[PDB]
Structure formats: structure tokens, C-alpha cells
Amino acid sequence: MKLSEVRKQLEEARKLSPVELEKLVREKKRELMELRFQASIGQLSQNHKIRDLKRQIARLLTVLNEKRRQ
């Protein structure tokens, strides 16, 4: 993911509520599994995407954590 796209994700994410953050992760964790399946059948040439989602999910969860801490 591009640097600017990362700033933007954090901005938008920090605006969501915890419930929305949970839901958004559950979607990305799903989109990840799809990437894993296309990885196994040899149909994912843009393999960097697998890393991206994993770190997006991390960032999202990190922020979700921020919210719950007060």
C-alpha cells in the first residue's frame, strides 16, 4: 500500500466506531482468505496484496484497540 494511502486509511479508520471497525476487519479478513485461495491455485500474480491486507487488518485492529482503551 502507498504511503499516502496508509495515512488516509488511518484517518478514515479513526473516525469509525468500534462496531464498524470490527465489521470492517471481518470483511478484510474475508478478502484475505480469497487472496490465499487464489495464491494456492497459482492465480495471484500480484502477491504483494497478501501482505497489504494483513497489515491493513493490523492497522485497523491497532486503532480498534486505541478506542477501547478509555
Binding site: 470490527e22 476487519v25 471481518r26 484475505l32 482468505m33 490465499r36 485461495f37 494456492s40
Partner: protein, 95 residues
């Protein structure tokens, strides 16, 4: 957080796993610590099906070496889920 997409990892791609599609038996690699009951709910919410029967087995990693360095592959666990009569998990029918 824990989701069904954390329990189902990859589909088992092999002659033996394919032969099960015909009678509606789908074979996935699952997280090694995952339960039959837990796998049931996981496959269902992922592929919108109805699981009737779950079989699991552990798959010890093969010992493998690279020159001087003897090692081992990660231990895996695979599950063979049974979908309700006439249902289909289409992602796997693929093939």
C-alpha cells in the same frame, strides 16, 4: 479478532480431495488447534452452506533438509466437511 476466515486457511488441492466434491465432501486445511464444532460454524458462515459431518486429521510436517541444515515443515491439520444433500461450495468446484 477471531473469524471463520481465521479457521479456514486454504483448500486441499489433490486427487484425493477432488474425488470428494462429487459426494459433497470438501477438504480444507484448517488451523491445527481448531475444533470440529468450530470448523462447522466456520465453513458455513464462509461458504453459506449447511455442514452435516466433519472429519479431521493431523498432518505432520515432512522433515526436509537444505545441505548442512536439517529441518521440518510446519505441521498441518486438514478437515473434510460434509455439506447437506444437494448443496455446493462453488469456490472449490473450480476446480
Amino acid at each position: 479478532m477471531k473469524t471463520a476466515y481465521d479457521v479456514i486457511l486454504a483448500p486441499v488441492l489433490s486427487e484425493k480431495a477432488y474425488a470428494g466434491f462429487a459426494e459433497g465432501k470438501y477438504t480444507f486445511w484448517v488451523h491445527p488447534k481448531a475444533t470440529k464444532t468450530e470448523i462447522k460454524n466456520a465453513v458455513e458462515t464462509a461458504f453459506k452452506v449447511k455442514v452435516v459431518k466433519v472429519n479431521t486429521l493431523h498432518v505432520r510436517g515432512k522433515k526436509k533438509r537444505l545441505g548442512r541444515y536439517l529441518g521440518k515443515r510446519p505441521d498441518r491439520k486438514k478437515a473434510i466437511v460434509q455439506v447437506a444433500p444437494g448443496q455446493k461450495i462453488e469456490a472449490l468446484e473450480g476446480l
